[PDB]
Amino acid sequence: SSLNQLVSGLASGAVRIVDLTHTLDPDFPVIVLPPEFGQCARFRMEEISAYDHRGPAWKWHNISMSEHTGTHFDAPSHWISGKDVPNGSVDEIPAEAFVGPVVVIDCSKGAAENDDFELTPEIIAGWESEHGRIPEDAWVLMRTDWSKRRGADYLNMRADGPHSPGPTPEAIRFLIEERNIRGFGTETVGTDAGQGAHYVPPYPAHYLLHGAGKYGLQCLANLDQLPATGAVLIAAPLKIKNGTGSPLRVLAMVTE
Amino acid sequence: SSLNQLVSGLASGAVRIVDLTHTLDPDFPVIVLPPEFGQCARFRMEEISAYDHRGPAWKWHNISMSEHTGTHFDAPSHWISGKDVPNGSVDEIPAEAFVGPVVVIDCSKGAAENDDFELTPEIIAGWESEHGRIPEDAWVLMRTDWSKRRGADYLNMRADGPHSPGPTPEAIRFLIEERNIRGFGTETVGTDAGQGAHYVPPYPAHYLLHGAGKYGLQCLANLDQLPATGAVLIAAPLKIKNGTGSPLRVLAMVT
Ligand SMILES: O=C(OCc1ccccc1)c1ccccc1
Ligand SMILES: O=C(OCc1ccccc1)c1ccccc1
Ligand SMILES: [Mn+2]
Ligand SMILES: [Mn+2]
C-alpha cells in the first residue's frame, strides 16, 4: 500500500521531511498594516513552571499570538469575500485538504532584482512549459528566497508601505479559474504583494482566493529545498473555533 | 514514488484522513493540578477586526492558551527527566518524527468499567499475540473512548484528584525498552493515569517517556475510527522557541 511504502521511506530517508516553518519567537516579524487598523501580534511566551516550586518535575509555558503570527494558514473566512464559504473556518476545513500535492514556482532571481516582483500569467505559462500543467487541487508556492532576509529587509517597509513580491490579480484568477488550485503560499508575510492594496481589486490574492474557498500560506521557509513538482505538502492548521487561520507546522515530504 | 500513489489515493478516497483533534474552545477542559502549582490555561480568543473599522475587509483574532491546552504534544524537555535529552524542545525535534506508523490498543471496554483502568504488559502481550509486535519507532495510542466524555466527566475530578485511565510503569518501560516506541498518546488530559502520582516513579509515562527522549500526545479524539495497525499519524507541533509542547492538529491517514 502507499502508506506502508511511505512508512518505509520515511524510516530509511528515501522520503525526507523538509520543515517549511520559521520558529515562533517574540522577535520574528509579523505583518504590519496601516496604523488606523488593528495589528497582528507577535508571539509571546511565559513560564508557568521550570522544575521549581511552581511545578517541581515539569516545565511549561503560557503562549499568546494571533491567528496570523509566524508561518501560518489563511482560511476563507479571513476575508470579507469568504464570509459565506461553507467549511470556511480552520476548524471546519475537511481534513483531506491538509495533505496534498504541491508545485513550487522559482521566482528567486526576479525577487533578487525587484522587491516588488510580480508573479504573472506569463510566468506561470513559462513554468508549465517546463514542468507540465499544474495539477488540479494543488498548492502553488511562489518561491522567492525572501525567507533568507533576517532584519528589516524581511517586511521591507518604505514610506508608502511594504515592498515584497506577490501575484497579480490576473495570475490569481488564472490559478483559481483555469487550474482549480487548493491554495497559494509565499515566503513573505502576505499572499499578496506588499503594495497589493493598489491592485484591482485590492489585496487580490486574499479577495479572490478566499472568495473562491481557497487557502493561503505565509512566512514559509526553505522553499529552495523543494522540487518544482512531486512533493507533498502537510499544512494542518490548529482547530480554532470559528478561526480564520492559525500558526502551524508546515512540512513537505520529498522523494530523494 | 510512494508520494504519487499517496496523492492519487487521497484524491480518489482510497486513502482517508481522520481528524484526531478537539476544537480549541474556551469551554474545553484542560489539565488541573494540585492548587499549590501553576496551572494550565484555557483557550481564549478575541477579535482584532471582523470586517469593521479596525480592518474593513478582513477578520482575524488574537489567541492565548498554554503549550498543554487541548489536543497537544509533549516534548522531552517538558519533564525534569528530559533535561539532558538532545533536541528536547518542539522546535528541535527532527521533522521525520512528525509522520510515522501508529498502532492503537483498544482499552475502551476496560475504561467503561473502571475510571482508573490500567494498560499493563499483559494487555500489550495480548495485543501482540493478535497483531504481531509493536513496530519499532511507532506511535502507540491507548484507545479508551474517553474523548466521548463531556464537561466534568472528562477530567473526572474527585476529592482525591482525577480518575482517568493510563499505563503502568512496567507497561511504559516495556514499550520504551523492548519496542523502542516513538511516543505514547491518550484520549485524556495526561499520558499518565489520573491517579498516576502514586506510581513509582510518579507520573511514570511522563517520567520514563521524556527521560528516554520520547513524545506524548494528549486529548486525542476519534480513536475509534482507527485500525489497530496500518494507519499513519501526522503529529507536527508548533515550532515554539525552546517549547516544551504545543497544541496541534493531529491526523491519521488510513487505507
Ligand atoms: O497580505 C495582506 O496585505 C498584503 C501585505 C503583504 C505584505 C506586507 C503587508 C501586507 C493582508 C493580510 C491581512 C490583512 C490585510 C492585508
Ligand atoms: O498526566 C497527569 O499529570 C501529569 C502532569 C503533571 C504536571 C504537568 C503536566 C502533566 C494527569 C493525568 C490526568 C489528569 C491529571 C493529570
Ligand atoms: Mn494571514
Ligand atoms: Mn501535556
XYZ file of C-alpha atoms and ligand atoms in Angstrom:
545
model
C 0.000 0.000 0.000
C 1.048 3.618 -0.440
C 1.027 4.055 3.361
C 3.254 1.020 4.072
C 5.702 2.293 1.436
C 5.508 5.807 2.891
C 6.365 4.492 6.374
C 9.348 2.550 4.985
C 10.636 5.514 3.004
C 10.282 7.901 5.940
C 12.100 5.439 8.163
C 15.018 4.978 5.741
C 15.256 8.538 4.463
C 14.134 7.636 0.926
C 11.353 10.135 1.726
C 12.639 13.203 3.536
C 10.567 15.710 5.517
C 11.531 19.331 4.940
C 10.355 21.768 7.617
C 8.955 24.893 5.960
C 8.296 26.650 9.285
C 10.003 29.582 10.987
C 10.422 29.492 14.765
C 7.647 31.109 16.777
C 9.657 33.693 18.646
C 8.826 37.149 20.094
C 11.231 38.855 17.688
C 10.098 37.244 14.462
C 8.400 39.937 12.335
C 4.678 39.879 11.704
C 2.544 41.667 9.143
C 2.137 45.422 9.702
C -0.880 47.251 8.282
C -1.740 50.940 8.059
C -1.784 52.421 11.537
C -5.533 53.064 11.708
C -6.174 49.304 11.745
C -5.803 46.636 14.404
C -2.478 44.841 14.110
C -1.204 41.282 14.208
C 0.529 40.359 17.472
C 3.992 38.953 17.959
C 4.425 35.575 19.591
C 4.852 35.657 23.369
C 5.566 33.012 25.969
C 5.850 32.981 29.771
C 6.852 30.200 32.166
C 4.229 28.531 34.325
C 6.983 26.447 35.996
C 10.519 25.323 35.231
C 11.265 22.341 37.524
C 10.826 24.627 40.539
C 8.379 25.245 43.374
C 5.635 26.151 40.873
C 5.876 22.700 39.264
C 8.674 20.608 40.676
C 9.069 17.953 37.950
C 7.976 19.837 34.818
C 8.451 22.943 32.667
C 5.717 24.545 30.572
C 4.550 27.918 29.327
C 1.619 30.140 28.598
C 1.620 31.365 24.987
C -0.128 34.058 23.017
C -0.123 35.211 19.405
C -2.509 35.960 16.604
C -4.040 33.566 14.120
C -1.706 35.215 11.565
C 1.575 35.190 13.516
C 4.567 33.449 12.002
C 4.307 30.660 9.458
C 0.549 30.440 9.185
C -2.529 29.326 7.268
C -5.366 31.563 5.983
C -8.919 30.130 5.791
C -11.640 31.614 3.541
C -13.454 33.361 6.417
C -10.378 35.582 6.906
C -11.576 37.768 4.015
C -14.872 39.625 3.616
C -15.316 37.839 0.263
C -15.075 34.430 2.004
C -17.536 35.133 4.813
C -20.219 32.824 3.319
C -17.967 29.953 2.082
C -19.011 26.602 3.638
C -16.294 24.892 5.691
C -14.680 28.332 5.728
C -13.049 28.343 9.177
C -9.921 26.351 10.181
C -11.980 24.117 12.471
C -14.275 23.091 9.573
C -11.937 22.644 6.596
C -12.067 18.945 5.595
C -9.015 17.045 6.780
C -8.206 15.726 3.288
C -7.354 19.353 2.411
C -4.412 19.235 4.864
C -2.272 16.817 2.789
C -1.801 17.154 -0.954
C 0.388 17.794 -3.975
C 2.410 20.981 -4.171
C 4.221 22.753 -7.003
C 6.926 25.367 -6.479
C 7.467 28.257 -8.915
C 11.017 29.628 -8.565
C 10.840 33.420 -8.679
C 14.021 33.896 -6.622
C 16.012 35.564 -9.430
C 13.231 38.043 -10.123
C 12.772 38.826 -6.429
C 16.516 39.480 -6.022
C 16.293 42.146 -8.763
C 12.968 43.743 -7.818
C 11.460 43.933 -4.321
C 8.017 44.268 -5.962
C 8.500 41.321 -8.365
C 5.198 40.117 -9.810
C 4.093 36.563 -10.456
C 2.147 36.872 -13.722
C 0.187 34.575 -16.053
C 3.158 34.675 -18.425
C 5.495 33.356 -15.704
C 3.035 30.601 -14.805
C 2.858 29.644 -18.502
C 6.646 29.517 -18.621
C 6.686 27.224 -15.620
C 4.081 24.916 -17.133
C 6.053 24.757 -20.395
C 8.882 23.118 -18.393
C 7.063 21.220 -15.632
C 3.683 20.431 -17.184
C 0.229 21.618 -16.300
C -0.289 22.472 -12.647
C -2.387 19.557 -11.301
C -5.888 20.251 -10.045
C -6.308 20.880 -6.303
C -2.577 21.516 -5.780
C -0.881 24.009 -3.530
C 1.100 26.543 -5.559
C 4.069 28.075 -3.730
C 5.809 31.207 -5.027
C 9.437 30.713 -4.108
C 11.411 33.949 -3.757
C 14.018 33.038 -1.113
C 12.602 36.020 0.856
C 12.831 33.805 3.947
C 16.592 34.352 3.972
C 16.130 38.036 4.945
C 16.849 38.376 8.660
C 16.260 42.033 9.537
C 14.135 44.965 8.482
C 14.572 43.718 4.895
C 12.006 40.975 5.560
C 8.984 43.258 5.954
C 10.868 45.799 3.817
C 8.757 48.777 4.823
C 9.266 52.039 2.941
C 7.420 55.352 3.269
C 4.481 54.024 1.229
C 4.367 50.686 2.984
C 5.930 47.292 2.381
C 7.655 46.247 -0.829
C 7.678 42.497 -1.304
C 6.857 40.125 -4.183
C 3.434 38.737 -4.953
C 0.902 37.702 -7.608
C -1.064 39.945 -9.891
C -4.870 39.728 -9.994
C -4.618 38.047 -13.392
C -2.195 35.447 -12.030
C -4.518 34.574 -9.155
C -7.551 34.466 -11.450
C -5.720 32.070 -13.755
C -4.745 29.737 -10.912
C -8.274 29.666 -9.459
C -10.378 29.581 -12.623
C -8.136 27.762 -15.061
C -6.283 25.408 -12.682
C -8.582 24.995 -9.615
C -5.701 25.211 -7.128
C -6.149 24.338 -3.445
C -4.236 27.364 -2.195
C -1.294 29.678 -2.679
C 1.742 30.117 -0.434
C 4.625 32.569 -0.123
C 7.793 33.302 1.858
C 6.642 36.830 2.750
C 4.140 37.943 5.379
C 1.385 38.149 2.731
C -0.096 36.092 -0.044
C -0.423 39.498 -1.725
C 2.434 41.730 -2.796
C 3.472 44.342 -0.222
C 1.904 47.003 -2.475
C -1.137 44.741 -3.085
C -3.606 47.323 -1.737
C -3.148 49.112 -5.083
C -4.186 46.235 -7.365
C -7.708 45.961 -8.737
C -9.350 44.544 -6.620
C -7.241 45.497 -3.586
C -5.379 42.583 -1.997
C -6.416 40.363 -4.918
C -4.855 37.147 -3.671
C -6.829 37.410 -0.453
C -10.010 38.699 -2.078
C -10.053 36.179 -4.924
C -8.587 33.120 -3.203
C -10.843 33.354 -0.200
C -13.902 34.352 -2.260
C -13.395 31.053 -4.088
C -12.945 28.973 -0.931
C -9.176 28.636 -1.391
C -6.447 28.796 1.240
C -3.288 30.804 1.873
C 0.092 30.115 3.444
C 2.521 32.851 4.561
C 6.025 33.083 6.027
C 7.124 29.766 4.573
C 10.817 28.854 4.855
C 13.189 26.555 2.950
C 11.339 26.519 -0.370
C 14.765 26.270 -2.050
C 14.887 22.719 -0.704
C 11.828 21.596 -2.672
C 11.487 20.186 -6.190
C 9.270 22.054 -8.631
C 6.948 19.009 -8.781
C 6.425 15.742 -6.902
C 6.486 16.822 -3.260
C 3.558 16.513 -0.866
C 2.601 19.356 1.446
C 1.320 18.861 5.002
C -0.459 22.000 6.196
C -2.871 21.243 9.037
C -3.937 24.369 10.963
C -4.971 24.407 14.597
C -8.638 23.531 15.146
C -9.582 27.033 16.388
C -13.304 27.512 16.961
C -14.599 29.694 14.073
C -10.943 30.516 13.400
C -9.818 32.474 10.350
C -6.316 30.997 10.279
C -3.616 29.661 12.527
C 0.108 29.328 13.008
C 1.100 25.819 12.035
C 3.972 23.427 11.318
C 4.149 23.271 7.523
C 6.055 20.239 6.200
C 6.912 18.921 2.750
C 7.613 15.268 2.004
C 10.178 14.929 -0.794
C 11.299 11.835 -2.696
C 15.072 11.526 -2.529
C 7.090 7.022 -5.986
C 5.287 6.369 -2.732
C 4.243 10.036 -2.883
C 2.446 9.944 -6.275
C 0.481 6.893 -5.091
C -0.423 8.738 -1.901
C -1.606 11.820 -3.796
C -3.868 9.851 -6.115
C -5.175 7.753 -3.209
C -6.096 10.857 -1.227
C -7.848 12.274 -4.305
C -9.796 9.072 -5.023
C -10.718 8.234 -1.429
C -8.551 5.075 -1.287
C -6.657 6.897 1.495
C -8.761 8.776 4.053
C -7.673 11.344 6.654
C -9.203 11.173 10.111
C -9.025 14.283 12.321
C -7.999 13.296 15.878
C -8.275 16.810 17.282
C -10.735 18.545 19.589
C -11.748 22.080 18.743
C -9.852 24.747 20.683
C -12.637 26.424 22.631
C -12.775 28.281 25.981
C -15.113 25.572 27.296
C -12.884 22.557 26.612
C -11.354 21.248 29.873
C -7.626 21.467 30.495
C -5.457 19.591 32.975
C -5.973 20.590 36.635
C -3.114 20.006 39.128
C -2.956 20.389 42.926
C -3.658 24.060 43.677
C -0.219 24.939 45.037
C 1.180 24.514 41.495
C 0.978 26.756 38.466
C -1.946 25.770 36.259
C -2.637 25.254 32.554
C -4.725 27.958 30.889
C -7.902 27.544 28.875
C -8.027 28.636 25.269
C -9.085 32.278 24.730
C -9.690 34.257 21.536
C -10.539 37.893 20.837
C -11.186 39.760 17.577
C -8.618 42.147 16.133
C -11.168 43.048 13.445
C -14.265 41.494 11.857
C -14.720 43.356 8.547
C -15.106 46.580 10.512
C -13.467 49.944 11.198
C -10.471 48.071 12.697
C -9.923 46.079 9.476
C -12.594 46.689 6.885
C -12.111 43.680 4.551
C -10.803 41.022 6.950
C -11.488 39.096 10.151
C -8.781 37.761 12.488
C -8.153 37.113 16.178
C -5.656 37.145 18.975
C -5.386 33.825 20.772
C -3.888 32.681 24.037
C -3.550 29.335 25.742
C -0.833 27.138 27.193
C 1.579 24.776 25.477
C -0.523 21.978 27.028
C -4.035 23.202 26.174
C -6.356 20.958 24.174
C -5.148 18.258 21.822
C -1.423 18.698 22.405
C 2.089 17.299 22.021
C 4.638 16.892 24.862
C 8.359 17.177 24.045
C 11.043 15.645 26.311
C 12.011 18.995 27.914
C 8.523 19.112 29.448
C 9.666 16.723 32.208
C 12.603 17.136 34.568
C 13.793 13.691 33.424
C 14.165 15.143 29.899
C 16.693 17.841 30.847
C 19.737 16.132 29.282
C 17.989 14.812 26.139
C 19.215 16.301 22.818
C 16.681 18.045 20.588
C 14.300 18.038 23.515
C 12.136 21.039 22.584
C 9.371 21.194 19.956
C 11.410 23.463 17.699
C 14.346 20.997 17.665
C 12.685 17.605 17.232
C 13.746 16.162 13.826
C 10.863 16.586 11.368
C 10.815 12.903 10.412
C 9.431 12.276 13.887
C 6.198 14.105 12.907
C 4.878 11.482 10.427
C 5.051 7.779 11.207
C 3.314 4.460 11.816
C 0.774 4.242 14.630
C -0.808 1.320 16.449
C -3.951 1.517 18.554
C -4.579 -0.692 21.583
C -8.336 -0.817 22.272
C -8.928 -0.362 26.034
C -12.432 1.102 25.631
C -14.242 -1.779 27.339
C -11.929 -1.580 30.339
C -12.302 2.196 30.635
C -16.109 1.797 30.596
C -15.900 -0.393 33.729
C -13.025 1.312 35.592
C -12.305 5.063 35.541
C -8.792 4.104 36.722
C -8.205 1.404 34.108
C -4.562 0.358 33.680
C -2.798 -0.565 30.458
C -0.406 -3.346 31.504
C 2.363 -5.501 29.991
C -0.140 -8.389 29.915
C -2.581 -6.373 27.801
C 0.233 -5.367 25.472
C 1.297 -9.020 25.166
C -2.256 -9.999 24.290
C -2.335 -7.315 21.614
C 0.962 -8.514 20.183
C -0.287 -12.120 20.093
C -3.053 -10.898 17.779
C -1.218 -8.219 15.756
C 2.492 -9.071 15.958
C 4.990 -6.999 17.830
C 4.588 -3.249 18.035
C 6.812 -1.811 15.265
C 9.979 -0.008 16.229
C 9.597 3.781 16.350
C 5.802 3.599 16.198
C 3.354 5.829 17.984
C 1.264 3.789 20.438
C -2.226 5.094 21.204
C -4.215 3.838 24.172
C -7.800 3.993 22.951
C -10.333 4.360 25.762
C -13.132 6.376 24.088
C -12.598 8.844 26.947
C -12.956 11.580 24.323
C -16.695 10.847 24.305
C -16.975 12.173 27.867
C -18.045 15.794 28.088
C -17.932 18.504 30.717
C -16.925 17.477 34.209
C -16.898 13.739 33.359
C -13.832 14.260 31.172
C -11.385 15.432 33.866
C -13.405 13.329 36.344
C -12.161 15.082 39.467
C -12.935 13.680 42.939
C -11.749 14.753 46.382
C -8.609 12.640 45.892
C -7.872 14.011 42.417
C -8.749 12.937 38.883
C -9.776 9.413 37.931
C -8.879 8.511 34.330
C -7.126 5.586 32.608
C -3.446 5.230 31.883
C -0.390 2.975 31.655
C 1.550 1.314 34.419
C 5.291 1.988 34.829
C 6.026 -1.537 33.603
C 3.870 -1.065 30.517
C 5.727 2.130 29.585
C 9.128 0.573 30.324
C 8.259 -2.370 28.076
C 7.234 -0.064 25.226
C 10.411 2.059 25.557
C 12.986 -0.658 26.251
C 11.644 -3.639 24.310
C 9.841 -1.927 21.427
C 11.638 1.459 21.107
C 8.403 3.328 20.533
C 8.373 6.914 19.266
C 5.711 8.121 21.656
C 2.503 7.382 23.501
C -0.916 9.027 23.083
C -4.187 9.070 25.022
C -7.722 10.484 24.955
C -7.367 12.029 28.403
C -5.616 15.166 29.625
C -2.497 13.168 30.502
C -0.328 10.403 29.181
C -0.439 9.185 32.792
C -3.426 7.851 34.666
C -5.299 10.467 36.701
C -4.050 8.778 39.896
C -0.566 8.324 38.397
C 1.183 10.458 41.034
C 1.034 7.329 43.193
C 3.027 5.052 40.893
C 6.771 4.550 41.337
C 8.154 6.677 39.731
C 5.347 9.263 39.974
C 3.749 10.101 36.633
C 5.704 7.256 35.022
C 4.603 7.857 31.444
C 5.938 11.409 31.629
C 8.997 10.485 33.636
C 10.017 7.483 31.541
C 8.941 8.654 28.083
C 10.591 12.030 28.324
C 13.678 10.606 30.079
C 14.115 8.404 27.012
C 13.653 11.250 24.522
C 10.158 10.085 23.571
C 6.991 12.096 22.964
C 3.457 12.258 24.284
C 0.067 13.124 22.865
C -2.974 14.036 24.940
C -6.650 14.856 24.427
C -6.877 12.879 21.192
C -10.327 12.365 19.678
C -11.918 9.876 17.291
C -9.524 6.969 18.017
C -12.407 4.562 17.423
C -12.107 5.474 13.710
C -8.648 3.935 13.505
C -7.470 0.396 12.746
C -5.233 -1.407 15.217
C -2.398 -1.346 12.662
C -1.600 0.251 9.305
C -2.522 3.903 9.858
C -0.035 6.756 9.634
C -0.058 9.505 12.246
C 0.679 13.155 11.449
C 1.564 14.978 14.655
C 3.625 18.095 13.945
C 3.812 20.504 16.890
C 4.133 24.242 16.561
C 7.717 25.442 16.225
C 7.823 27.254 19.581
C 11.262 28.576 20.559
C 12.553 26.199 23.227
C 8.989 24.985 23.622
C 8.026 22.070 25.854
C 4.906 21.163 23.896
C 2.169 22.656 21.815
C -1.444 22.380 20.777
C -1.550 20.825 17.339
C -3.756 19.305 14.681
C -3.318 15.527 14.944
C -4.393 13.490 11.897
C -4.247 9.893 10.802
C -4.104 8.601 7.249
C -5.999 5.299 6.854
C -6.143 2.928 3.867
O -1.383 40.386 2.963
C -2.364 41.382 3.038
O -1.627 42.514 2.960
C -0.695 42.356 1.943
C 0.640 42.594 2.611
C 1.741 41.894 2.150
C 2.959 42.151 2.742
C 3.063 43.030 3.782
C 1.957 43.711 4.245
C 0.723 43.498 3.652
C -3.258 41.498 4.271
C -3.366 40.489 5.213
C -4.206 40.646 6.306
C -4.968 41.827 6.420
C -4.850 42.808 5.449
C -3.997 42.660 4.377
O -0.605 13.126 33.429
C -1.037 13.584 34.692
O -0.429 14.789 35.025
C 0.942 14.817 34.747
C 1.339 16.273 34.598
C 1.797 16.999 35.692
C 2.155 18.321 35.501
C 2.057 18.905 34.252
C 1.594 18.172 33.163
C 1.232 16.847 33.341
C -2.554 13.775 34.767
C -3.424 12.869 34.170
C -4.786 13.031 34.245
C -5.343 14.085 34.938
C -4.484 14.991 35.537
C -3.095 14.842 35.478
Mn -2.563 35.579 7.200
Mn 0.968 17.957 28.107
